[PDB]
Amino acid sequence: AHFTFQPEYGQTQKMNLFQSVTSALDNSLAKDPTAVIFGEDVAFGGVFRCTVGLRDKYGKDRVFNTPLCEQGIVGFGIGIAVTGATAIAEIQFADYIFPAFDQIVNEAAKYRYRSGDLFNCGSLTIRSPWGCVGHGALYHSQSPEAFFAHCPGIKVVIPRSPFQAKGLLLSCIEDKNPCIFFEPKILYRAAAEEVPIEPYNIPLSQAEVIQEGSDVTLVAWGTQVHVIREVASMAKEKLGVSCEVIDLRTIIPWDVDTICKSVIKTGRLLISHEAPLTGGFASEISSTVQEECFLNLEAPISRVCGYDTPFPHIFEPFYIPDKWKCYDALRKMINY
Amino acid sequence: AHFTFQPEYGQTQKMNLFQSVTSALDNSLAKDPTAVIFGEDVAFGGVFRCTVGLRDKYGKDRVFNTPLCEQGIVGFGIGIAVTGATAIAEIQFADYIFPAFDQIVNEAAKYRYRSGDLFNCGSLTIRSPWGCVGHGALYHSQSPEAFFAHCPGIKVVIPRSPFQAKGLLLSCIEDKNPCIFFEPKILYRAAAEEVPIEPYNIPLSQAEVIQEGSDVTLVAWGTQVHVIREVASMAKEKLGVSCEVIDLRTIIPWDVDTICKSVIKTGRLLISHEAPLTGGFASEISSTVQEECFLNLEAPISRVCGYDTPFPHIFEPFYIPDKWKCYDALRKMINY
Amino acid sequence: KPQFPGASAEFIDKLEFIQPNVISGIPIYRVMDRQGQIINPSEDPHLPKEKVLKLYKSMTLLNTMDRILYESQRQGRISFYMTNYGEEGTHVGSAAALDNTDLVFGQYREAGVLMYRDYPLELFMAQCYGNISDLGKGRQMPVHYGCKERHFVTISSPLATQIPQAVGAAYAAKRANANRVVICYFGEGAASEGDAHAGFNFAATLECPIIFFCRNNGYAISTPTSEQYRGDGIAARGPGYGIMSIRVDGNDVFAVYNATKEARRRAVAENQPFLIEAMTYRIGHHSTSDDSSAYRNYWDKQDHPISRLRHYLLSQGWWDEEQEKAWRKQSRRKVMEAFEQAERKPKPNPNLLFSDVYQEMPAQLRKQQESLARHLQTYGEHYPLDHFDK
Amino acid sequence: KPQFPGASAEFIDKLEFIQPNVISGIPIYRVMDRQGQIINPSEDPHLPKEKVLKLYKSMTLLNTMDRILYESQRQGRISFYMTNYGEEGTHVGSAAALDNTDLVFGQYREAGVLMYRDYPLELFMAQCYGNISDLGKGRQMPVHYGCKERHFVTISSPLATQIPQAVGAAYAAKRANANRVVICYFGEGAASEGDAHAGFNFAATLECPIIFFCRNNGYAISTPTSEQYRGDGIAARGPGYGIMSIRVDGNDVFAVYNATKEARRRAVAENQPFLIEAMTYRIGHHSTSDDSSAYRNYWDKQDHPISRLRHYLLSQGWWDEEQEKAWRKQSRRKVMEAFEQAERKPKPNPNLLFSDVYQEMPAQLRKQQESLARHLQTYGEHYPLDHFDK
Numbered sequence A, B: 001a002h003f004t005f006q007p008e009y010g011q012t013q014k015m016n017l018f019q020s021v022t023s024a025l026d027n028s029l030a031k032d033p034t035a036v037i038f039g040e041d042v043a044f045g046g047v048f049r050c051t052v053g054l055r056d057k058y059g060k061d062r063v064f065n066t067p068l069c070e071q072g073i074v075g076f077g078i079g080i081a082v083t084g085a086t087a088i089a090e091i092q093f094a095d096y097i098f099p100a101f102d103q104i105v106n107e108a109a110k111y112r113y114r115s116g117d118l119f120n121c122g123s124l125t126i127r128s129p130w131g132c133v134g135h136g137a138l139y140h141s142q143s144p145e146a147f148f149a150h151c152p153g154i155k156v157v158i159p160r161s162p163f164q165a166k167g168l169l170l171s172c173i174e175d176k177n178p179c180i181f182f183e184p185k186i187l188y189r190a191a192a193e194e195v196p197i198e199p200y201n202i203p204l205s206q207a208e209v210i211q212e213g214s215d216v217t218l219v220a221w222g223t224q225v226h227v228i229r230e231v232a233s234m235a236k237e238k239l240g241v242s243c244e245v246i247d248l249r250t251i252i253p254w255d256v257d258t259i260c261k262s263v264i265k266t267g268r269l270l271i272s273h274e275a276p277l278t279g280g281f282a283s284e285i286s287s288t289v290q291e292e293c294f295l296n297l298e299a300p301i302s303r304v305c306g307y308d309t310p311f312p313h314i315f316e317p318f319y320i321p322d323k324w325k326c327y328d329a330l331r332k333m334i335n336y
Numbered sequence C, D: 001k002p003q004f005p006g007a008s009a010e011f012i013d014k015l016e017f018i019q020p021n022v023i024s025g026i027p028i029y030r031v032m033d034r035q036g037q038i039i040n041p042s043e044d045p046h047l048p049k050e051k052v053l054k055l056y057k058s059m060t061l062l063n064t065m066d067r068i069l070y071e072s073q074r075q076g077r078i079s080f081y082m083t084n085y086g087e088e089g090t091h092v093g094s095a096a097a098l099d100n101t102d103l104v105f106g107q108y109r110e111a112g113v114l115m116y117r118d119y120p121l122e123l124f125m126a127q128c129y130g131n132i133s134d135l136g137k138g139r140q141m142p143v144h145y146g147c148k149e150r151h152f153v154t155i156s157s158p159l160a161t162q163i164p165q166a167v168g169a170a171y172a173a174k175r176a177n178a179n180r181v182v183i184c185y186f187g188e189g190a191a192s193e194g195d196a197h198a199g200f201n202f203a204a205t206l207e208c209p210i211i212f213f214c215r216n217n218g219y220a221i222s223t224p225t226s227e228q229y230r231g232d233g234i235a236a237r238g239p240g241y242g243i244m245s246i247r248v249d250g251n252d253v254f255a256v257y258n259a260t261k262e263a264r265r266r267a268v269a270e271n272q273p274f275l276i277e278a279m280t281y282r283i284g285h286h287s288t289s290d291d292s293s294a295y296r297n298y299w300d301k302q303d304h305p306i307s308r309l310r311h312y313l314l315s316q317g318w319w320d321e322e323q324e325k326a327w328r329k330q331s332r333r334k335v336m337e338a339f340e341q342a343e344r345k346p347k348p349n350p351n352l353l354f355s356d357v358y359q360e361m362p363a364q365l366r367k368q369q370e371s372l373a374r375h376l377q378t379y380g381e382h383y384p385l386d387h388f389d390k
């Protein structure tokens, strides 16, 4: 693996990321009788087991399969939410979200604004597996968050672990705005830690500083947080460099203040993501940080991203912004 | 109007922007017997008159209406191009390009790469009216170029005038990659100047410095180039500030070298676009410039963009990044 | 016997393609002729006088409003308009067959449905003018109406997107045990969109109490139906999805009413979708941005829904020339009163450009709002501030 | 007589909804019974011995390859695989009815069509292994085959996107005066996508010489057809678009052949689309990522396309147990030879990750390629370099 996963609220049980998602969904339907879950193959428990047992527990009218049609799944979910009922849509891979792009961007995101708040689809959440998986190639590996980041009126949220996933997913489900929740699929089985059995929330639009540091700020989300955590370890050991490691968590609206506060302290910033460099969300963070922290920045902000190509099958190990590519970029930025 | 338009290759005639597009299309079909033009309402000459007279000249099999279905229009255009024939698709407003987002991003952009160049859709061009129009509100005003800028394998091109439009459109049509050509609709009738009757090309991925300056670099595209040209005039007169005014022309792949060369000289950069700030293409330019020109930058790079909202009807005059908003941002950046 | 899971059918031992029936398509249901005469007594809904008068007054009040607002647009007083000429019967015939709280999703050419539900002239006007009385806060282009009180979901420009949405709202209604039906209107051009195939199939598979109501008016902007499809219109698509389907004379308010009333009864009882294709003709330009003489009446003078209804009223002794004259005067007065009021109202505060993007206002969006406020403090002379509230 | 532009039809004076015929759907055309006996002599295509032997050898060679590569996947030697079990008849029956240069667009479960067109075992293997012999340069996941020489457009994962593409290629062929037909294969789940409605309608309206070939195998991953649609399968949708349509027994190579041969003849003569829905059953798991026992044979043992064809060969005196044994041995040898070769070949140079994104390489993409090269010079020990060419 290109990464290693490392691991108050009542009783906890060890859960992997798919189980934490099921736990979030189970808690949601238990406490909200309007809530339904639907999409391709969710009835038997889903192709990544995220809905196992839920149809048996809650009923076929509440956890059900749709026809194979993403523009339909999202339009359908919007219409449920228009009536005020919680609609938890699944899109089977984030790579196949694009047929629904018009329903998300022209409809869901704009529903409240364009009606003057006479109607809304706030009770819609769209959840979808995301990010690389070792051999997913062009259409089972994508990270589409930057496409959505340019659309006012939706929220886009990506967890890094089972504890994070359940708390952020419950927040998405309960938030009064259409949310896209991207689940890093490589972590579905790989990442396991203690997760509260009962519901709890983690706030949206809030980054988490998972390791304090003084020489450089590192920002990522999803699986890539584990890569930069290792990079922080490599930098300490090899270079005597102290890294502040931040998980952004919410792509939009993003926590500008937490990132700027960090860079004001450290003077240096490296942002990394699996998605291609050009038009990637690191561009928005880098621009903004430059605008707010100009006088504090000691070196150009570094972006270590996927290359500007489609996501390859056999070349995956060479494509991803792995710990060595991040480390090397950091080293140069430290030397700057 | 929020802007004023101001105006070798053989005989020219005065043409407005819609006429320059017709001239490009007419020259294209005359010289390429495979070329066809299709989309909603193109047969009678189009809702913005861009195809007037072409069906009568070239035949109903070559200029024809499709059913009202954008995902179909683009998928259909890709299939024509797969056979090697030139396919010039129209999407009636850029706001309605989204139903075709999956065909553009997952299919057209990736066609050559994923086949190892066994198949391609290089001979596809998609042209669509774009940008604000005074009263277009949410769905006849959009500027979607940043959504497409995050997709390797397509080119995205936006002209600022009739002369520019015909030369860039011919280049798109003849380029061996799927291209999206966004036509600023407010200029269709408003901007008129001399345009060569016979075909000519303007290169893609090449910015144009339309006015040399020494104190600050200003970058825009489409109608916004005329706004920043006026801003350059305001700055000279009011502040004694010399502005270098650059029209980017191609969104991707963009002319990084021309922009960096300018900022290395001036030390300051302001980028403006009608599209919303967050995730907008100014973020990519600002990040890149900061990375390449760090030692030359005397002030934070400024981005003067649409607000992060949907595009309003009655509030349009307050929404757009007009000459006063650009001027004021420039003034502050000069004072920095 | 065939065993395949995907279909229920017999074997056949001869090769035979199934041909579409396009020349003799699904017949057009019609109740009254062009002279307002009932053709088949057993199909007469015998609607009471007051209700039939409301159908008539609704269509003519809409017609009066259309004429005035079309003129306002031509003069530049509003930015855009779209008339309902020739299609007024489809709107009122169908709306009258619905329960008051049935939820409506539309396209943009169904304003008669709102009129029938007593949407105030002041609010149609407020939306077109984008003034302070508009609950939509002037954000959308004209004729993009919506009313939460009258269960009419806000219109949006992207065609057919409301089709799968309406299905989801119908599924939610079923779960809620509503005794409510959703109706979803769209044009024959919009029916070419992928979202129509999405919506039709979902409504059948998921067993939703919805009526799909297609106005087939012969053109989608410039495009005649010969370039829009090649099967037997939209009604012939419904059975393929397992949807009970019917075609009606959309210029006959009684045919539209009967079809809609029975669809509603069955959709709500049975949790199954119905499809009604109302054949009509777009008498007006597509919109104020269209000059339709560029691509194409008998319809206006020989088969108009309003004329037909008027003939029916006369035959019952329910209307005469004196009433027609008085109503013409009263309706003009009512429309003109609303028009004058709407023109005198200010536009909403420019602050409202920033609210409702999310339910709450994100701090970074508030920063943008603040930036505008500072900008207008300094440069306000360059903006139309005197026109805007506060 | 009705005058509406949108449909050709009579009036009807009684309210009658059109009901779908789902219980007695479109019948299933079948030529030979499950014992390989011809049912109706007038429908027998009397294909010559060598051609029928090629159908049989093609399906069994595919079956041998599927078994080996499925095992290779289970062992982790390839990353993914999808078998063709139960559907081999639809592939070879249809491919044999095409002209060699007819253009094929597919979904992913049509590898028999390539086999029938003599695609080398080495190239099926090269794609699955992503090795240096793969003309796709190892960029796509396994079974995403493509061959420009054999007119088989590269498979892509997004479902149904090839449907409107295939229509465009068919329109281009018509213009070129090709005497060529495009065939477009897709599953019954893929047919729920908006792009299917796009493609069907465009092909009718624009009069394109295309055959739409739907493999209805009862499931889309876990989802049974009862949750996929409620009309009479996919064939009943075609007439609604004005498309000549037929349903065939997809486990009968002769029924598939006859239907495809006549569709091709008529589509090319008439410039009109045809739709064939081949009823079958997905015997295998959906893919190596699926354990199908989680949601669901009679099919494998009582109605398999290969078994049926074998019975037919025997009845003609065209095959026997000795030949069956020798062919089983020879085909295993051929597949095993290709397999060993494919496993020993290196992967392509990592440089190839950057080419063909655009036809040319943009300077900024070359900068990225250069950055990788420098990176591997320094950190190369941390990468699987010994496996990759150059």
Ligand SMILES: CC[C@H](C)[C-](O)c1sc(CCOP(=O)(O)OP(=O)(O)O)c(C)[n+]1Cc1cnc(C)nc1N
Binding pocket: B040, B068, B070, B092, B096, B099, C108, C109, C156, C157, C158, C159, C186, C187, C188, C189, C190, C191, C215, C217, C219, C220, C221, C282, C286
């Ligand atoms: C108020 C302005 C309107 C909404 C406008 O933009 C429209 S209306 C329209 C024609 C629709 O024809 P139709 O469905 O037959 O309906 P009628 O106008 O009632 O005949 C198009 C192609 N358009 C353009 C269009 C194209 N594609 C999409 C997805 N949405 C659109 N609105």
Ligand SMILES: CC[C@H](C)[C-](O)c1sc(CCOP(=O)(O)OP(=O)(O)O)c(C)[n+]1Cc1cnc(C)nc1N
Binding pocket: A040, A068, A070, A092, A096, A099, D108, D109, D156, D157, D158, D159, D186, D187, D188, D189, D190, D191, D215, D217, D219, D220, D221, D282, D286
């Ligand atoms: C090789 C991996 C494949 C291509 C994969 O990702 C698939 S296959 C598939 C089931 C398709 O069922 P079908 O069309 O009946 O075809 P069969 O597998 O032959 O029964 C789905 C939902 N998916 C997921 C999927 C969902 N949505 C879209 C738009 N495309 C997909 N590929």
Ligand SMILES: [Cl-]
Binding pocket: A133, A136, A140, A185
């Ligand atoms: Cl996976």
Ligand SMILES: [Cl-]
Binding pocket: B133, B136, B140, B185
């Ligand atoms: Cl316009």
Ligand SMILES: [Cl-]
Binding pocket: C382
């Ligand atoms: Cl001014």
Ligand SMILES: [Cl-]
Binding pocket: D382
């Ligand atoms: Cl290592």
Ligand SMILES: [K+]
Binding pocket: A122, A123, A124, A125, A172, A173, A174, A175, A176, A177, A178, A179
């Ligand atoms: K939500």
Ligand SMILES: [K+]
Binding pocket: B122, B123, B124, B125, B172, B173, B174, B175, B176, B177, B178, B179
């Ligand atoms: K091109």
Ligand SMILES: [K+]
Binding pocket: C106, C107, C155, C156, C157, C158, C159, C160, C161, C162
């Ligand atoms: K809509």
Ligand SMILES: [K+]
Binding pocket: D106, D107, D155, D156, D157, D158, D159, D160, D161, D162
């Ligand atoms: K495909």
Ligand SMILES: [Mn+2]
Binding pocket: C187, C188, C189, C215, C216, C217, C218, C219, C220, C221
């Ligand atoms: Mn129409």
Ligand SMILES: [Mn+2]
Binding pocket: D187, D188, D189, D215, D216, D217, D218, D219, D220, D221
């Ligand atoms: Mn299937």
